[PDB]
Amino acid sequence: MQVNRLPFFTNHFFDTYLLISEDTPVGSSVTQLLARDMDNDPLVFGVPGEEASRFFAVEPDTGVVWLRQPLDRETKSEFTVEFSVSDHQGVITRKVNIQVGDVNDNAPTFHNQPYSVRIPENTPVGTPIFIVNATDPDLGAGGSVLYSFQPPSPFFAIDSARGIVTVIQELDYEVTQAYQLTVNATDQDKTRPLSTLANLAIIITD
């Protein structure tokens, strides 16, 4: 009589990691588990343990792993997931680190709103009067924010990197007492840049 031999996984990702982009649609396959058994036993695959099993499902006969609900890198950027394989006499499990890949899916959010500032009519050209700031949690160019006026103003400029707003032309109360400007903060993602608007009220005092 031959004692049962338990099955063993063969995927090489168990030795390194598995990368899944956060824009994988629900229902999509992310990999396939592979295993062997010296008895030639037919194998049933699974994902035990509650947290992993909320995001990942596995077709028990084929080992195809698939996505049960959306991943979100900004919410949770990695998982340690235990998969199981069974020859109907024993189960063995084995863990893999899953790294969630980023895509640019957030627009920047502004800090310290609302934005309003009173300045004198005689404020000299060149004077910094206000600082805008926005942050963006995506990685890389998707997280790096640029500021502008939409449209540009003949009287105020904003530094595209630092959000510093300056007067660039002499003001005149009798012509304009208040300016409502739209500030755009955009990330720098190549294919899908995202952006956000805030108002900036500038009140000219006599």
């Binding site: 004692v3 338990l6 063993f8 168990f14 030795d15 390194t16 990691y17 990368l19 982009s21 084995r94 680190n97 790294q99 890949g101 980023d102 895509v103 995506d138 990685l139 890389g140 160019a141 998707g142 997280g143 790096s144 640029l146 530094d159 595209s160 990197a161 630092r162 720098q188 190549k190």
Partner: protein
């Protein structure tokens, strides 16, 4: 025309397509100066007499990574220590940020680098005790389990991960006690429980020395590690 000067925002952006993170893998206990990333592929020139970018590392915890800005190369800084994935150090990964400042426009972009540390089979099985013992009654039936002392971390353990750290036990022939591997058996190599396979006879033989070897389960049979212990089995009359 709007966007005529978008060329000045190009520096510090990736010179490649693909996802934003740069992920690589290297073996644990790699030598000082081992290359982690050959080329970060960031647009612009760092260093030299007229650079368009400044490059540096942020969140470089314990200074494992060194950067050569001119080549845009990242290296392991391991001198006087070892990059160890096994307990007690347990470094499974190193995450750092390459900060890139565009000199012309002042924008800053962070490029994340994850280094996945791969396990080597650099540890052998280790027995908790220098030797083991069992007493068995002479009328013990054949097929009875007479030793379970490897249960629950009391036998061999191996600090490596996965199969590099899973153990199998086998009995070896003892040329100084020839019949011991014929009288006792380990049918289930994973547990290492020893079972009696021939009837004992106290009037003939009162002590057995069973040589037991534990091996790990590295993928390459040539990279497996082993360690031997002895089980001394004494017969009792009462």
């Amino acid at each position: 025309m709007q966007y005529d000067d978008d060329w000045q925002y190009e520096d510090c952006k990736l010179a490649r397509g693909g996802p934003p993170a740069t992920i690589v893998a290297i073996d644990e206990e790699s030598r000082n100066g081992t290359i982690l990333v050959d080329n970060m592929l960031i647009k612009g020139t760092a260093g030299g007499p007229d650079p368009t970018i400044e490059l540096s590392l942020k969140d470089n915890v314990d200074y494992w990574v060194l950067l050569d800005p001119v080549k845009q190369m990242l290296f392991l800084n391991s001198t006087g220590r070892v990059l160890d994935r096994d307990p007690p150090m347990n470094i499974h990964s190193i995450v750092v940020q390459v900060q890139c400042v565009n000199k012309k426009v002042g924008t800053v972009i962070y490029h994340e680098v994850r280094i996945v540390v791969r396990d080597r089979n650099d540890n052998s099985p280790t027995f908790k005790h220098e030797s083991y013992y069992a007493t068995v009654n002479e009328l013990t039936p054949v097929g009875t389990t007479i030793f379970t002392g490897f249960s629950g971390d009391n036998g061999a353990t191996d600090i490596d991960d996965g199969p590099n750290g899973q153990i199998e036990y086998v009995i070896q022939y003892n040329p100084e006690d020839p019949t011991s591997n014929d009288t006792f058996e380990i049918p289930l190599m994973l547990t290492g429980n020893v079972v009696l396979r021939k009837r004992l006879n106290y009037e003939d033989k009162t002590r057995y020395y069973v040589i037991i070897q534990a091996n790990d389960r590295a993928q390459n049979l040539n990279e497996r590690r082993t360690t031997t212990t002895t089980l001394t089995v004494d017969l009792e009359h009462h």
